[PDB]
Short mmCIF file of C-alpha atoms in Angstrom, two decimals:
data_model
loop_
_atom_site.label_atom_id
_atom_site.label_comp_id
_atom_site.label_asym_id
_atom_site.label_seq_id
_atom_site.Cartn_x
_atom_site.Cartn_y
_atom_site.Cartn_z
CA UNK A 1 58.37 -1.16 -25.83
CA UNK A 2 57.03 -0.82 -21.92
CA UNK A 3 57.68 -3.78 -19.91
CA UNK A 4 55.38 -5.41 -18.07
CA UNK A 5 55.71 -8.62 -16.91
CA UNK A 6 53.50 -11.59 -18.61
CA UNK A 7 53.85 -9.79 -21.87
CA UNK A 8 54.16 -11.94 -24.72
CA UNK A 9 57.80 -11.42 -26.63
CA UNK A 10 59.23 -13.57 -29.57
CA UNK A 11 62.51 -14.92 -29.78
CA UNK A 12 64.37 -14.85 -32.79
CA UNK A 13 61.09 -14.35 -35.44
CA UNK A 14 60.12 -17.88 -34.02
CA UNK A 15 59.03 -19.23 -30.34
CA UNK A 16 56.70 -16.69 -28.04
CA UNK A 17 57.63 -16.91 -24.79
CA UNK A 18 55.86 -14.15 -21.67
CA UNK A 19 58.27 -11.77 -19.84
CA UNK A 20 59.15 -12.35 -15.90
CA UNK A 21 60.10 -9.23 -14.51
CA UNK A 22 61.72 -5.57 -14.59
CA UNK A 23 64.85 -5.66 -13.68
CA UNK A 24 68.50 -3.22 -14.10
CA UNK A 25 72.14 -3.96 -13.90
CA UNK A 26 73.72 -0.94 -13.09
CA UNK A 27 72.89 1.21 -16.08
CA UNK A 28 71.53 -1.62 -18.59
CA UNK A 29 68.09 -2.00 -18.86
CA UNK A 30 66.47 -6.14 -18.84
CA UNK A 31 64.00 -8.15 -17.92
CA UNK A 32 63.96 -11.48 -16.35
CA UNK A 33 62.50 -14.98 -18.31
CA UNK A 34 62.67 -18.56 -18.86
CA UNK A 35 65.84 -19.88 -20.13
CA UNK A 36 64.82 -22.26 -22.18
CA UNK A 37 63.28 -19.10 -24.19
CA UNK A 38 66.20 -18.93 -25.55
CA UNK A 39 70.15 -18.91 -26.20
CA UNK A 40 72.35 -16.22 -25.62
CA UNK A 41 72.51 -13.25 -28.23
CA UNK A 42 68.67 -14.33 -30.03
CA UNK A 43 66.85 -11.97 -30.77
CA UNK A 44 63.69 -10.46 -28.66
CA UNK A 45 61.43 -8.80 -30.12
CA UNK A 46 57.73 -6.76 -28.78
CA UNK A 47 54.70 -5.27 -31.06
CA UNK A 48 56.67 -5.58 -33.62
CA UNK A 49 60.38 -4.17 -32.61
CA UNK A 50 63.16 -5.27 -31.68
CA UNK A 51 64.14 -4.41 -27.88
CA UNK A 52 67.10 -6.50 -26.95
CA UNK A 53 69.00 -10.06 -27.22
CA UNK A 54 69.21 -12.59 -24.43
CA UNK A 55 72.63 -11.94 -22.38
CA UNK A 56 72.78 -15.16 -20.52
CA UNK A 57 70.80 -18.19 -19.64
CA UNK A 58 71.21 -21.46 -18.06
CA UNK A 59 69.30 -24.25 -19.07
CA UNK A 60 68.81 -27.02 -18.31
CA UNK A 61 69.92 -27.53 -14.57
CA UNK A 62 68.16 -24.46 -14.06
CA UNK A 63 65.46 -22.56 -16.22
CA UNK A 64 66.92 -18.98 -16.21
CA UNK A 65 67.34 -16.01 -18.35
CA UNK A 66 67.71 -12.15 -18.77
CA UNK A 67 67.53 -9.74 -21.45
CA UNK A 68 69.36 -6.98 -22.02
CA UNK A 69 67.28 -4.18 -23.91
CA UNK A 70 68.18 -1.15 -25.31
CA UNK A 71 67.95 2.11 -23.40
CA UNK A 72 64.92 3.28 -25.66
CA UNK A 73 62.33 0.34 -24.19
CA UNK A 74 60.72 1.80 -20.66
CA UNK A 75 61.07 -0.71 -17.29
CA UNK A 76 58.00 -0.59 -15.52
CA UNK A 77 57.65 -2.22 -11.59
CA UNK A 78 54.34 -4.57 -13.08
CA UNK A 79 52.74 -7.87 -13.62
CA UNK A 80 49.65 -7.57 -16.25
CA UNK A 81 46.57 -8.97 -14.29
CA UNK A 82 43.79 -8.84 -17.53
CA UNK A 83 43.58 -5.13 -18.53
CA UNK A 84 44.62 -3.89 -14.55
CA UNK A 85 48.47 -4.70 -13.13
CA UNK A 86 50.05 -5.68 -9.83
CA UNK A 87 53.28 -3.89 -8.27
CA UNK A 88 55.79 -5.38 -7.89
CA UNK A 89 56.72 -4.32 -4.72
CA UNK A 90 60.27 -6.88 -3.70
CA UNK A 91 61.45 -10.19 -3.83
CA UNK A 92 59.90 -11.85 -0.70
CA UNK A 93 59.85 -15.27 -1.27
CA UNK A 94 56.77 -17.19 0.53
CA UNK A 95 56.47 -20.31 1.77
CA UNK A 96 54.27 -23.32 0.96
CA UNK A 97 50.67 -22.98 1.57
CA UNK A 98 51.06 -18.91 0.28
CA UNK A 99 48.67 -18.48 -2.45
CA UNK A 100 50.05 -16.94 -5.44
CA UNK A 101 49.36 -16.33 -9.00
CA UNK A 102 51.10 -16.46 -12.41
CA UNK A 103 50.75 -14.13 -15.63
CA UNK A 104 51.66 -15.38 -19.30
CA UNK A 105 50.28 -14.77 -22.80
CA UNK A 106 48.62 -18.00 -23.46
CA UNK A 107 46.20 -18.30 -19.87
CA UNK A 108 46.25 -14.74 -18.71
CA UNK A 109 46.78 -14.15 -15.05
CA UNK A 110 46.34 -17.16 -13.05
CA UNK A 111 45.88 -18.06 -9.25
CA UNK A 112 46.77 -21.01 -6.80
CA UNK A 113 49.18 -22.19 -3.81
CA UNK A 114 52.57 -23.24 -3.75
CA UNK A 115 52.49 -26.84 -2.91
CA UNK A 116 56.02 -27.85 -2.96
CA UNK A 117 59.50 -26.80 -3.27
CA UNK A 118 63.05 -28.21 -5.19
CA UNK A 119 60.84 -29.60 -7.47
CA UNK A 120 62.85 -31.69 -10.25
CA UNK A 121 61.41 -31.34 -13.92
CA UNK A 122 62.67 -34.05 -16.45
CA UNK A 123 62.44 -32.12 -19.64
CA UNK A 124 63.03 -33.46 -23.26
CA UNK A 125 66.47 -31.14 -22.94
CA UNK A 126 67.29 -32.82 -19.59
CA UNK A 127 66.77 -32.52 -15.67
CA UNK A 128 65.73 -28.92 -14.32
CA UNK A 129 66.27 -29.34 -10.36
CA UNK A 130 65.19 -26.60 -7.43
CA UNK A 131 61.78 -25.82 -8.87
CA UNK A 132 58.64 -24.54 -6.63
CA UNK A 133 55.71 -26.25 -7.92
CA UNK A 134 52.34 -24.39 -7.64
CA UNK A 135 48.77 -25.22 -8.52
CA UNK A 136 47.99 -21.76 -10.26
CA UNK A 137 46.99 -23.34 -14.08
CA UNK A 138 49.13 -22.62 -17.24
CA UNK A 139 49.62 -23.41 -21.05
CA UNK A 140 52.75 -23.63 -23.80
CA UNK A 141 53.80 -19.79 -24.12
CA UNK A 142 53.07 -18.85 -20.54
CA UNK A 143 56.93 -19.34 -20.59
CA UNK A 144 58.66 -17.30 -18.78
CA UNK A 145 56.36 -15.61 -17.36
CA UNK A 146 56.25 -13.64 -14.08
CA UNK A 147 54.90 -15.40 -10.78
CA UNK A 148 53.62 -12.96 -7.96
CA UNK A 149 51.82 -12.79 -4.70
CA UNK A 150 48.74 -10.25 -4.84
CA UNK A 151 50.57 -7.93 -2.37
CA UNK A 152 53.19 -7.92 -5.08
CA UNK A 153 55.98 -10.39 -4.10
CA UNK A 154 57.92 -11.27 -7.40
CA UNK A 155 58.63 -15.25 -6.49
CA UNK A 156 60.00 -16.51 -10.41
CA UNK A 157 59.37 -16.78 -13.56
CA UNK A 158 57.44 -19.61 -15.17
CA UNK A 159 59.50 -22.81 -16.43
CA UNK A 160 57.29 -25.75 -16.93
CA UNK A 161 54.07 -28.27 -15.89
CA UNK A 162 52.01 -30.62 -16.96
CA UNK A 163 50.25 -29.39 -19.78
CA UNK A 164 47.37 -32.25 -21.37
CA UNK A 165 46.29 -32.34 -24.94
CA UNK A 166 44.85 -28.70 -25.06
CA UNK A 167 48.44 -26.98 -24.35
CA UNK A 168 47.34 -26.28 -20.58
CA UNK A 169 46.66 -27.90 -17.06
CA UNK A 170 43.51 -25.37 -16.50
CA UNK A 171 40.98 -28.19 -17.91
CA UNK A 172 41.65 -30.40 -15.24
CA UNK A 173 41.25 -29.90 -10.66
CA UNK A 174 44.20 -27.53 -8.84
CA UNK A 175 44.80 -31.14 -6.95
CA UNK A 176 45.72 -32.30 -10.32
CA UNK A 177 48.38 -29.44 -11.32
CA UNK A 178 52.19 -29.43 -11.41
CA UNK A 179 52.98 -26.31 -12.41
CA UNK A 180 56.92 -25.29 -12.06
CA UNK A 181 58.57 -21.96 -11.24
CA UNK A 182 62.01 -20.80 -11.20
CA UNK A 183 63.09 -19.03 -8.10
CA UNK A 184 63.53 -15.45 -8.39
CA UNK A 185 66.75 -14.73 -5.30
CA UNK A 186 69.02 -16.93 -7.84
CA UNK A 187 68.29 -15.42 -10.91
CA UNK A 188 68.66 -12.05 -9.30
CA UNK A 189 71.91 -12.58 -7.97
CA UNK A 190 73.85 -14.84 -10.26
CA UNK A 191 73.42 -11.79 -12.33
CA UNK A 192 73.52 -8.89 -10.25
CA UNK A 193 70.13 -8.15 -11.11
CA UNK A 194 67.87 -5.77 -9.28
CA UNK A 195 64.25 -5.65 -9.12
CA UNK A 196 62.18 -2.43 -10.19
CA UNK A 197 59.93 -1.85 -7.87
CA UNK A 198 57.01 0.44 -6.86
#
């Protein structure tokens, strides 16, 4: 399969999440995603085919993971925006106030701004600290998906947010949204990963 940020993948033929970013670890191909999406050794599938397994994850506390892919997979420096693509050009972290977008299999490509950093989320499993908050909307299933600026700077992966009864927070004003992502930089260094760029 072609690995693009924002696309759907399943975990152990059960839960669904979204791809964060194509990365490499030496000769090994992979993609970063959210830790709550799967446990170590869990099987990832795209288009009905096995593409790899969860190599490592930290959740809760943090919310990160990377899926180690088979060499048959095709890594791409891109994030889905409708039928088009946003090119991944680097991982410069944007400041509070910056515009930012996210991509996922439930709500697609959504944009907003970064409103706060170092935010704690109290999830069912425990607290996750150090998350960055934006007001682009999201929904259940967008987890693990790309957060990237229009200029191509990869920011992080979708962790969680204040989803309403309809499963997303797109039906409430941006001012009331808390959409949280796990910063990309600590994921890359923790697992010795290099972002695939173009």
